[model samples]
Target: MALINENFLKLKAGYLFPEIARRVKAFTEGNPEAAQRLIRCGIGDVTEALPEAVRYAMHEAVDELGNRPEQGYDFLRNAIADNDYKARGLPIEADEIFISDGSKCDTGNILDIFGQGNTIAITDPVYPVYVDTNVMIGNTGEADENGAYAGLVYLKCTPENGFVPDIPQEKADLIYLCYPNNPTGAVATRPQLEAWVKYARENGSVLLYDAAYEAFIQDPTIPHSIFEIEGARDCAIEFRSFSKNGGFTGVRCAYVVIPKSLMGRKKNGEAQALHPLWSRRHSTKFNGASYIVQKGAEALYTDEGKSQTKALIEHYMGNAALLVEACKNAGLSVFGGVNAPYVWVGCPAGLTSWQMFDKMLNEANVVITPGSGFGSAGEGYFRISAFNSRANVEEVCRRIAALK
Candidate 1:
């Protein structure tokens, strides 16, 4: 018989998205008429056309690529550095950027470079992948009924603190932080990130900063990149994606930055550079993102690309505001949607997250993500994604009013 990784068995019954689909499927079968009216405010998948600039660039690349493309071509890398970083006055070099298919894979595969037996720190009500990937790698012990895995520090975020986690006193080998957070749509302020950067440096921990949704940040005060925090290059690795902004969700392209100055420990207690380690791993494993996709991503920096992407954001953010108003009008407490594309809504009394999910489905004919699917801290709340057409969102708003 073949041996297998037992850690695979440790995962829960389902990942968050599939479970939502299962419920939606069962509901549709039970009520055919209602199924036709269902509006999905569940997963944060984009529902817009790709920016024209990206489409044109993708066509241009298709014409150019009879041969294998460069392994993360310089043209795309330089564009990212100039437009995404240096234009903002940050010192990120083109070579320092490692292009990948998406942040979902980049964030999980990043564990390959680090050794075993290191403490992983994550926020509660966090992205499921962040938690599940660590579990798969045997970073933690067993999970409890609430899905809180052992041997990990969970930083709880509540409305009291504005949804940004506080710096922990405990030591962690690796820390995962996402701004313009997935479910909550929360963005960190410069001061909040400065505190975390200070903590990581003091404890010699590596911060895996996910800024995939940074382009949606509407407020000028918010810090889009962790690099905006002083000393972040020494202790942090930043992740970015064109998926959310450029509507490249289908055309996948993202990147990670592991500063050459960043270091980690070895078996003999000698410090080793992380940039080369990641570079080597990336080169060995990733053939490269598709030439067409990279071209689409590169178009995001062009004058036309910037204008089109800005309009895309405005549309989504506009939808977000409508969702917030709808939920608020229903007498439900609402959070998020101010700076991010998701709107986090509080469940009504006596209804659990799943119960609220069922309520939305049965009565309103709408689909949404349950808070409990995220983690224990996510209980008593649910998320409303703003990625929908204006007509659908307006109808959802009308239904919410009727639900009240």
Candidate 2:
């Protein structure tokens, strides 16, 4: 028999989305009437069409049938550096950007660059990829009943803290942080981020900062990238995606920012720059994202592309506003949906998150994500995605009102 990686066996029953899909599949298969009226506000997939500028540029790239540099095409990288970093006064260079298909992949695959035996610190109710990837890489022992794995430090993110986890008092080798967070939709303040940067520097930790939902941030004061904090270039790597803004969830294009100053230690305590390690690992196992896709991504920095993307963000943020109001009007507790596209709501009293999820699916025909699926801290709360069309979101609001 071929030996397999048994660490995979340690994963919980199923990945959260697949389990949600299973329940939905059963519900739809049995209730035909409900299936016809089903509106998914579960997964954070964009429902809009691609921008005209992106489409035009992608067509041109297809005609060109381009060759790509292993790291990423300069045309796209330069655009990202100029529009996303340089314009913001961050010191990120084009060469520091590594193009990838998705942040989901980048966050998980990034484990390859670092050695094993790292002490991983994850936020409670975090994006599952961060936790599961560490488990798969043998960085953790068995998981507890709460679904928290051993050998990992879990910083609890509660409503009290606005869902931004506090900096741990103990040391951790690697830390995973996401702002405009996935399930909770919380963004960290500049001072809060500064604290984490300071913590990382003191402990010599590497921060894997995921800014995948940066485009949805409507707050003018919110820092879009971790690099906006002073001294972050030495301790953090950022992951960004075009999926949310460019409607590229299916189209697939994202990039990672690893500053040259960032360093990791060897077994003997010799420091090595992470930029080259990630570069080598990326070149060996990964080819660049498709030329057509990168060209489409590059177009996002253009005048027309920028205007079109702003419209897309406005649409999603509009949906979020509607969802937030509906939840509040129904007398439910709501958080998020201000600067981010996800609206986290407290389930009605006496209902668990799954019960709330079933109630929404069965009675309202609207699929929602149960909070407990994120982590134990998420129990009693549920997440509503604002990634649907205006018409669908309006209907969802009506359904929420009717439920009350």
Task: Judging by lDDT against the true structure, name the best candidate.
Answer: 2
What's each prediction's TM-score? 0.96, 0.96
The residue pairs found clashing in candidate 1 are none
Candidate 2 per-residue lDDT, tens place, 1-404, comes to 99999999999778889999999999999999999999999985565457788889988988898553878899989999999999989999999999998899899999999998888888878778888888898888988877888888988888897687878877998999888787888888899999999999989899999999898888888999999999999899999999855445655889999999999999999999999998998889998788889888888888998898888788888999999998999999999898777798999999999999999999999999999887788889999988888899999999999994
lDDT of 2: 0.88
Q: Could you tell me the TM-score of candidate 2?
A: 0.96
Model 2 misplacement above 4 A: 66-68
* Model 1 poorest ten-residue lDDT run: 62-71
| Colliding pairs, model 2 | none
